[PDB]
Design a protein around this ligand. Structure first.
Ligand code: ZN
Ligand code: ZN
Ligand code: ZN
Ligand code: ZN
Length: 259
């Protein structure tokens, strides 16, 4: 029937009608309350190893845009922190708002940022992303907040290509992109067990949400909003507000990597 989305009839408040895990015990995103998040001395140092990352292409999937990487080798990986083993970078994408005052998925003390970046990784314990996403320890998503301020040079190559992938299904070559340019200086983070923030909402993600945002310009974020959810020849639906509301923490603890 109708595929899920972010619109009035197919968006987040309705996803449970087809994906009942939406009301599960380990759903994402959540509010991160800084007064109750607790330092966990058992966390090991976090290793973000992106020196050899090979980007390939950028795709408008009708929900967001994904920048895909070659994940055939243990090169662009995340290790340490809360993770056991090695997690390969497969793609990143963003969530953003119809205006700068909303857009992020996670919140910090109920505050929203203009957008949120997700760097998606899968556990090489499993054969590939499709096998990993079915497992509780399968995925690790590095979440980074975008705050409006000065323009980010590391984002400019992304925003420059978006007019070539305006509608669902369009893709373009996207090579030689350095995802380190989308990282803040500090890797202090919060972590908790959660889920994909889109259908099928599987509870297979270890979330690692960095405390320090990256700064982007209002003009850069506005370029995100010129994408469309629809395919060519369908009524125009601007790609905005492609975020899920925060969900109940339930019986989970958000841990901090910092004292
Ligand atoms: Zn569908
Ligand atoms: Zn609080
Ligand atoms: Zn889809
Ligand atoms: Zn995401």
């Amino acid at each position: 029937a109708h595929h899920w989305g972010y619109g009035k009839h197919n968006g987040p408040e309705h996803w449970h009608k087809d994906f009942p895990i939406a009301k599960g015990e380990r759903q994402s995103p959540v509010d991160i309350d800084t007064h109750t998040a607790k330092y966990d001395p058992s966390l090991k140092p976090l290793s973000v190893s992106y020196d050899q990352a090979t980007s390939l292409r950028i795709l408008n999937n009708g929900h967001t845009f994904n920048v895909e990487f070659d994940d055939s080798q243990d090169k662009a990986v995340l290790k340490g922190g809360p993770l056991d083993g090695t997690y390969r970078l497969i793609q990143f994408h963003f969530h953003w708002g119809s205006h700068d005052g909303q857009g992020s998925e996670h919140t910090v003390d109920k505050k929203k940022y203009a957008a949120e970046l997700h760097l998606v990784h899968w556990n090489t314990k499993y054969g590939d992303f499709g096998k990993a996403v079915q497992q509780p320890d399968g995925l690790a998503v590095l979440g980074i907040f975008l705050k409006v301020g000065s323009a980010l040079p590391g984002l400019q190559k992304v925003v420059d290509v978006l007019d070539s992938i305006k509608t669902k299904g369009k893709s373009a070559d996207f090579t030689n992109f350095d995802p380190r340019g989308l990282l803040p200086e500090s890797l202090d983070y919060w972590t908790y067990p959660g889920s994909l923030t889109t259908p099928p909402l599987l509870e297979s993600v270890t979330w690692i949400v960095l405390k320090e945002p990256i700064s982007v310009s209002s003009e850069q974020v506005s370029k995100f909003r010129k994408l469309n959810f629809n395919g060519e020849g369908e009524p125009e639906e601007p790609m905005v507000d492609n975020w899920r509301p925060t969900q109940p923490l339930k019986n989970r603890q958000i841990k901090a990597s910092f004292k």
